[PDB]
Each structure stands twice: as C-alpha cells, then as structure tokens.
Amino acid sequence: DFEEIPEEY
Amino acid sequence: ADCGLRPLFEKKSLEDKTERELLESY
Amino acid sequence: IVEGSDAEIGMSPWQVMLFRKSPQELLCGASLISDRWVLTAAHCLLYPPWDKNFTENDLLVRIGKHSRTRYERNIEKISMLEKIYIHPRYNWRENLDRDIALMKLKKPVAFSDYIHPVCLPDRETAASLLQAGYKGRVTGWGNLKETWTANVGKGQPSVLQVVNLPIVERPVCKDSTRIRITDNMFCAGYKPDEGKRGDACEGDSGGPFVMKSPFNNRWYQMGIVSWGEGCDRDGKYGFYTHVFRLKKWIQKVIDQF
Ligand SMILES: N=C(N)N1CCC[C@H](C(=O)NC[C@@H]2CCCN2C(=O)[C@H](CO)NS(=O)(=O)c2ccc3ccccc3c2)C1
Numbered sequence A: 001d002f003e004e005i006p007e008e009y
Numbered sequence B: 001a002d003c004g005l006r007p008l009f010e011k012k013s014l015e016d017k018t019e020r021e022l023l024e025s026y
Numbered sequence C: 001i002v003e004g005s006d007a008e009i010g011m012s013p014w015q016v017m018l019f020r021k022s023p024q025e026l027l028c029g030a031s032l033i034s035d036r037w038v039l040t041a042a043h044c045l046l047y048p049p050w051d052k053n054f055t056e057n058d059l060l061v062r063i064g065k066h067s068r069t070r071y072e073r074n075i076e077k078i079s080m081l082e083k084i085y086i087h088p089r090y091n092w093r094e095n096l097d098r099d100i101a102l103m104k105l106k107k108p109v110a111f112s113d114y115i116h117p118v119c120l121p122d123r124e125t126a127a128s129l130l131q132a133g134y135k136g137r138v139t140g141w142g143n144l145k146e147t148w149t150a151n152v153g154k155g156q157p158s159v160l161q162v163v164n165l166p167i168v169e170r171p172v173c174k175d176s177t178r179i180r181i182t183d184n185m186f187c188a189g190y191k192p193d194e195g196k197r198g199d200a201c202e203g204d205s206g207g208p209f210v211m212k213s214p215f216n217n218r219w220y221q222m223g224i225v226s227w228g229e230g231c232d233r234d235g236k237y238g239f240y241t242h243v244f245r246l247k248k249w250i251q252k253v254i255d256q257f
Helices: B019-025 C123-129 C170-175 C243-254
Strands: C015-020 C026-032 C037-040 C059-063 C077-086 C101-105 C135-140 C161-166 C185-188 C208-212 C219-227 C238-241
Touching: B019 C135, B019 C161, B019 C208, C015 C037, C026 C059, C026 C219, C037 C219, C037 C243, C101 C243, C123 C219, C135 C219, C170 C185, C185 C219, C219 C243
Parallel strands: none
Antiparallel strands: C015 C026, C015 C059, C026 C037, C037 C101, C059 C077, C077 C101, C135 C161, C135 C208, C185 C238, C208 C219, C219 C238
16 A cells, blocks of 8 residues: 555656 | 764764664663 | 664665565665665565566665655655666575675665665774674564464554664574574574564565764664564574675675676
8 A cells, every 4th residue: 555656756 | 975974863963762772782 | 673663754864665666565675875876685686486586677766765655755765776786696595695785776866864875884893893782773664573374463564663683692693593694694683581672574674784883973784684584583583684794795886887
C-alpha cells in the first residue's frame, strides 16, 4: 500500500 | 557537507534521543 | 527495527530506500556515501537460490524519506541507477561472504537537511570502534516481528525504526550458528542474560550499521545488514558486512567509474 510514485520518476 | 555531520543535529549542536547510549558504551 | 523505536526526522540523512518499480514494494535499505553513490547488500539485488535478480531499471532510489509508505514531496528525492556493481567474490552459494554492492546514480542527488552522506571507516577508526561491547545503530523500514509463519507483531512500521545494538565477540558469534563466519562480517546483538534486545529483520537488508566517532563527532558506517536466523531470537545474532574490510574494493569502483 505505497503511495503512487510521481509517474515522471 | 562532509560526511557524517548531520544538518539537523551535529551542525546544530543538538544530540538525538539516544546517541548518548552509544558514546556512553565506549 | 524489532524492539526498535521511531526515528526522528533527519536522524539518518544517509538512509536510502530501495524501491521496486513494478510491483511497487520496498526491496531493501541502502546508504548514501557520496552524491552519486549508494551502498547496499549484494543479496538485495542478486540471489540465485530465490531467483532474485534486478537490473538497473528494475528499481529506484528514494532518498530523504521518513514515512515508509507515503510520497514525501519536497523532502525525499528519487534517483534512477546508471550502473550496479556487485562484489566479484560475493558468495551467494554458501555463506553470503562479501555481501556488498555499489550503485551509480544517473545524476547526483542534492543535499538538504534530510539528505546527507555517511562516512566510510579508516584503519584508526575501524580499529578503535569495532571492539566488542561498543554499540552501533541500525535503521530500517522492515518487519517489526519475525516472518517465520502466520504470526502477530506490528507488521511494518509507518516510520523509519532505529535500534542501538552492541557488538558481539567472535567466538560467541560463530558458536551461535552453523554457517561459516568469515573475517568480512561481524555480528551484533544482546546475549540472553543481558536483558535488553533488538534485531534487524526482513526488509532491513542492505541497511547501515553506523557508529559515532567520539574523536571527531562523525558517523561512520561500520556495517550493512546481511543475514540472520529469525529476528531478535535468543542465542542468535545478526550478521553484518564488514565495510572496512571491503573499503579497498569500494575505492576501485569509485576511482574508475
Ligand atoms: N532474518 C533476518 N533478521 N534478516 C535480517 C537481516 C537480513 C536478513 C536477510 O534476509 N538476508 C538474506 C539471506 C539470504 C537469503 C536468506 N537470508 C537470510 O538472512 C534468512 C533471513 O530469514 N535467513 S537464514 O536463517 O535461513 C539464513 C542465514 C544465513 C544465511 C547465509 C547465507 C545464505 C543463506 C542464509 C540464510 C533477514
């Protein structure tokens, strides 16, 4: 249950 | 900065909640 | 970790998290030694018996974190790896000897109050500090209890956990296990009748084992989380990779790549 990593990364 | 010197503690002259447990063990 | 305590903000500015891209999960812990270099355990990236093998872009490096799970924007920094360097004599086959890897970040992380490197030891420091009885500190985001079966214990923590462990004498360490110890790994933990306790556990592999130089106030990474039998078990100790013993190799990679 990890927060969504900023898709640019 | 140079390794091992923490900005929020050492560079501020503040010790953490248990570093004293370490230095004390020596 | 195990029998640990919530870390304070910026208490371990070198702590690094190893994060898997897909699925997104915590793989191991690591450490920042410079602006483009991170130190971890080799078995964190390679372990043939469990078909574990991650290439450069199978993972990310999250620096400056405190919360295990959240995305701390404006604090943490996520890097991408240019190259992974595993010790060429690393023994995954029998005892995890020389359990150490190095990772080259595509771009140098910037330093802040939450991101700062740790020091590597030198002869005089390794010599003076790595004496049994001396206490070092190990940090991580791993399980708060043994995994072994279906058991209770506050799963994983929401925040990074710190536990100050004492260094154990060699004859003791080697008598505690059937694995073949090697001068490239030390063991730390409290003995049965000492009363106190604590141990790294699953999810902390690769994590720093640091010490504070009373001769100059600098923190030095004496070890890296490698292996253990259970977690916080009586008569058992956690084994850590001997950085100093491997400092010559660490230097070759960095002074070439
Ligand atoms: N259990 C604890 N407290 N851990 C914390 C410290 C890091 C440990 C780690 O997993 N390391 C990866 C290695 C390689 C694969 C298995 N393993 C282990 O340390 C497991 C972890 O539960 N232990 S073991 O008892 O079965 C064990 C002990 C020593 C080992 C040495 C070489 C190869 C496999 C080993 C396996 C896990």
